[PDB]
mmCIF file of C-alpha atoms in Angstrom:
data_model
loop_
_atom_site.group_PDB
_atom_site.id
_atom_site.type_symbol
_atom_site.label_atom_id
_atom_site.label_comp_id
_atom_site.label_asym_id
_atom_site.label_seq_id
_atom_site.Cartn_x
_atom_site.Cartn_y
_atom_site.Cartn_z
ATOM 1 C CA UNK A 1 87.504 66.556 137.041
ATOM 2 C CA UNK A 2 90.142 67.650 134.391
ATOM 3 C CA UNK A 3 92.239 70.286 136.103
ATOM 4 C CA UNK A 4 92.935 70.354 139.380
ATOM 5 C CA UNK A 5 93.810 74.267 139.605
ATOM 6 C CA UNK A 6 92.231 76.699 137.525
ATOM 7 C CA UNK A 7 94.719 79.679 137.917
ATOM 8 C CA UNK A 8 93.219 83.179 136.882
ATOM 9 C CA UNK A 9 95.649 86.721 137.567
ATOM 10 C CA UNK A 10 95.534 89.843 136.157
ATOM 11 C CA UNK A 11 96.655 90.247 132.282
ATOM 12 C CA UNK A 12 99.751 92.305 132.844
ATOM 13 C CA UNK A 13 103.394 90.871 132.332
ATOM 14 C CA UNK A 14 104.822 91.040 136.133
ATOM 15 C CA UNK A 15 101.817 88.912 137.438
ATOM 16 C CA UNK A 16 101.195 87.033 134.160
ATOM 17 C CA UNK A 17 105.401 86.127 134.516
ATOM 18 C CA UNK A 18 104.456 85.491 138.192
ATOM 19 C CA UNK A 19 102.208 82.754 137.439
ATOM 20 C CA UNK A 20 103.676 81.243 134.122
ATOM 21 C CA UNK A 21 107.469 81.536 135.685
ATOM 22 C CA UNK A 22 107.235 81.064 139.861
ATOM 23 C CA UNK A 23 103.295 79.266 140.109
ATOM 24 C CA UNK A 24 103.278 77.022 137.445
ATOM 25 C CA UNK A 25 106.861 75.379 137.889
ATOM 26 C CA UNK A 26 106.300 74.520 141.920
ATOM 27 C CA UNK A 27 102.490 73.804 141.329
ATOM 28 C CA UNK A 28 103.550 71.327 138.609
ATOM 29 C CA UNK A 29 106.901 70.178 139.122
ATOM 30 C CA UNK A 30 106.966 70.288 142.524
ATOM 31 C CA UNK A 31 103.013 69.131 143.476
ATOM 32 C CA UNK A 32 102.219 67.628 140.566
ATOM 33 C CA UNK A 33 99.474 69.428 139.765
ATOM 34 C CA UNK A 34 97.906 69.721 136.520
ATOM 35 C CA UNK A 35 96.708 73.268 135.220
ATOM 36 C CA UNK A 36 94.189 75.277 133.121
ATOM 37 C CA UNK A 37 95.803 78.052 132.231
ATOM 38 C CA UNK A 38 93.175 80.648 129.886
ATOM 39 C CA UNK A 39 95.736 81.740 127.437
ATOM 40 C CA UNK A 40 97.710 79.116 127.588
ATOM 41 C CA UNK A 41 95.060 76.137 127.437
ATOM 42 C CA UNK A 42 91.872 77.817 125.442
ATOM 43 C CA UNK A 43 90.892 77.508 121.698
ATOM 44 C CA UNK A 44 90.323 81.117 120.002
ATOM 45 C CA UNK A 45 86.815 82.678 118.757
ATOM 46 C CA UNK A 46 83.486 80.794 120.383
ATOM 47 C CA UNK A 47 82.093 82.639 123.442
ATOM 48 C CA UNK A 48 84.630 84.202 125.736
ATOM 49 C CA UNK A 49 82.322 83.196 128.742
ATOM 50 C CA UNK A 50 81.516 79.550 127.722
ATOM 51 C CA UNK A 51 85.242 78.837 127.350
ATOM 52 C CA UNK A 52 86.254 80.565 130.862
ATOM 53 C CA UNK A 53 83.393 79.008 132.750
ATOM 54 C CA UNK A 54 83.897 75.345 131.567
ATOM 55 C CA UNK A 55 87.778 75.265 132.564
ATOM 56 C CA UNK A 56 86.425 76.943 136.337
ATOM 57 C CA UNK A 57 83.725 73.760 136.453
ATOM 58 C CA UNK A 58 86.272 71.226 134.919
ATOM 59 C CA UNK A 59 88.821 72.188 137.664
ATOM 60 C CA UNK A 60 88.996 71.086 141.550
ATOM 61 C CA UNK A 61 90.120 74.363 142.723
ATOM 62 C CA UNK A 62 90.662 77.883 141.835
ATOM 63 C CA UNK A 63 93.166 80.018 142.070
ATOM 64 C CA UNK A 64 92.446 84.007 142.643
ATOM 65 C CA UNK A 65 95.847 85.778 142.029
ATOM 66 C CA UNK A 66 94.488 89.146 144.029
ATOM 67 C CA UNK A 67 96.160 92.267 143.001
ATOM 68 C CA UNK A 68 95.129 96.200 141.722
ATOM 69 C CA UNK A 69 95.084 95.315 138.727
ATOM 70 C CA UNK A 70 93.329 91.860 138.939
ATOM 71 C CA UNK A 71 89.599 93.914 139.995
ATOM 72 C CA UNK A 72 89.937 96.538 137.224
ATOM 73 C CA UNK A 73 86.039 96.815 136.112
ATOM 74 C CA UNK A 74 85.811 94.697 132.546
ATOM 75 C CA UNK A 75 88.861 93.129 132.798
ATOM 76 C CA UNK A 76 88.791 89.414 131.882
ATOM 77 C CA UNK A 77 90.496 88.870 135.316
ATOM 78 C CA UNK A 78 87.238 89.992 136.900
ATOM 79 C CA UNK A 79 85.174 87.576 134.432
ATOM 80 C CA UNK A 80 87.172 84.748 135.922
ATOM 81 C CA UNK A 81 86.444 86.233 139.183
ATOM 82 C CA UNK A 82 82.561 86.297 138.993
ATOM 83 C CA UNK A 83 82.773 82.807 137.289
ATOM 84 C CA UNK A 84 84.382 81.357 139.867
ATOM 85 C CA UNK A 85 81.779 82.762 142.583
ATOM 86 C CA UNK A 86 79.463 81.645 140.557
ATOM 87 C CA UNK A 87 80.435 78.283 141.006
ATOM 88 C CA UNK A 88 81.376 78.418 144.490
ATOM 89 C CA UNK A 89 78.091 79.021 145.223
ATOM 90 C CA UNK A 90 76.395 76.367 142.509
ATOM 91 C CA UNK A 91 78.701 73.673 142.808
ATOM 92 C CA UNK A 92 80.950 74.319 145.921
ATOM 93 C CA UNK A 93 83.962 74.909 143.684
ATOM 94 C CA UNK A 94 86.707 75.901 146.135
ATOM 95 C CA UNK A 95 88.474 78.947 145.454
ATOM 96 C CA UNK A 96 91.868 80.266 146.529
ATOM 97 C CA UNK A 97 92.881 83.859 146.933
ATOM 98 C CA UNK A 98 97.106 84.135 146.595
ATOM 99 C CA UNK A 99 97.736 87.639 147.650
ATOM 100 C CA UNK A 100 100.588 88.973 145.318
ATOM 101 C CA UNK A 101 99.994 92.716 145.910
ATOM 102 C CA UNK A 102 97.158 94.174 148.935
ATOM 103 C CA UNK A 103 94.315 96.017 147.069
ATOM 104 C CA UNK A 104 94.125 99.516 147.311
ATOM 105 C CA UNK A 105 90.802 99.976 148.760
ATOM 106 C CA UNK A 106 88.612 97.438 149.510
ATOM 107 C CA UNK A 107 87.031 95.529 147.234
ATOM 108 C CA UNK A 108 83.297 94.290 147.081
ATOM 109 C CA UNK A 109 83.886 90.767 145.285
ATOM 110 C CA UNK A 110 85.779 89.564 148.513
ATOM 111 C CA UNK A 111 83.043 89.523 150.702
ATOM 112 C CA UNK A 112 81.387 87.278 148.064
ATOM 113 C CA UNK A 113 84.386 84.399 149.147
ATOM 114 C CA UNK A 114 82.828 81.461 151.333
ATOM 115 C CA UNK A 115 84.316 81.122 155.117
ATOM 116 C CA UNK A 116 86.185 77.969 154.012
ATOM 117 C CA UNK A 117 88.244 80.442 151.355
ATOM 118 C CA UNK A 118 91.897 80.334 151.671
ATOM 119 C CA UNK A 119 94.044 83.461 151.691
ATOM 120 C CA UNK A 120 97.957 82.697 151.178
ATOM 121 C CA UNK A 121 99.976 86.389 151.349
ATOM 122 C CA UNK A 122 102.666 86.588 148.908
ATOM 123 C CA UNK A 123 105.534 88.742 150.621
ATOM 124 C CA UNK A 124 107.776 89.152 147.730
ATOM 125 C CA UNK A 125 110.989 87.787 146.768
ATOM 126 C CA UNK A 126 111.597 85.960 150.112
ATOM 127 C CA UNK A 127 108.552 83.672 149.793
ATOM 128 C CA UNK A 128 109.721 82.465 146.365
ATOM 129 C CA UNK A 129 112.035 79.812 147.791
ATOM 130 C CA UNK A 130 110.924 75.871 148.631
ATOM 131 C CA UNK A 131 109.382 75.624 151.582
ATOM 132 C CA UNK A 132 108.306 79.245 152.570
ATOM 133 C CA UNK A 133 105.316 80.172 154.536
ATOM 134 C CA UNK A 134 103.754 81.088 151.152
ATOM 135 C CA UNK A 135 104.396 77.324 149.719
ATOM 136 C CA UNK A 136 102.996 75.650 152.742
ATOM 137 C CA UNK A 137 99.708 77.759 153.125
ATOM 138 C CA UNK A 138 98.969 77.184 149.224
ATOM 139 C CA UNK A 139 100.128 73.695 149.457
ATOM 140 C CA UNK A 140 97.235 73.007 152.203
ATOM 141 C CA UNK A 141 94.448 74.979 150.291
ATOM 142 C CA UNK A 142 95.522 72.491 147.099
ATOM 143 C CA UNK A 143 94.053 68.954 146.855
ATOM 144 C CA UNK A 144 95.108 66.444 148.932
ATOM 145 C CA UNK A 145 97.154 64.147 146.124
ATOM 146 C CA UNK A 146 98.038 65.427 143.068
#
């Protein structure tokens, strides 16, 4: 309704730089697409939860940025995570997984992705440019008109 991508990463400066530097600019500038961003978009204080899961339900997608540090156990990047299968499966929110570093070991939560999920692999410097592989996959998972 409000958003259309929702994008939650691990709190850590190389990914958080990753999506506030390389994601936003094409996603916005390029797409058009308007964002919810947590820390850049939410109001302080009132419950951490209620804030997180009203931007997921008030946006037409999701982004997962998937890295190590993205499924550390009580990490806020994790709350986003559950949130977000939570409304996949109440409300059919469609969620995105960008790959920006392979998890070492498998992880539990990805098995709770729908078939219909989207996973776009992140290769590094080289898909950074206009038009990479990267930019295409994501561009498809995204909503049709921005």
């Amino acid at each position: 309704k409000e958003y259309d991508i929702y994008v939650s990463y691990a709190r850590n400066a190389e990914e958080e730089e990753f999506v506030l530097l390389t994601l936003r600019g094409v996603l916005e500038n390029e797409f058009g697409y308007k964002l919810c961003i947590f820390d850049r978009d939410s109001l302080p204080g009132g419950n951490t939860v209620e804030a997180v899961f009203d931007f997921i339900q008030r946006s037409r997608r999701m982004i997962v940025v998937l890295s190590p540090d993205y499924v550390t156990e009580k990490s806020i990047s994790m709350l986003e995570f559950k949130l977000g299968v939570m409304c996949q499966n109440s409300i059919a929110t469609k969620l995105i997984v960008v790959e920006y570093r392979p998890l070492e070991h498998p992880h539990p939560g990805i098995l709770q992705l729908k078939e219909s999920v989207s996973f776009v692999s992140w290769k590094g410097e080289k898909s950074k440019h206009s038009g990479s592989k990267f930019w295409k996959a994501l561009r498809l998972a995204l909503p049709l008109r921005s």
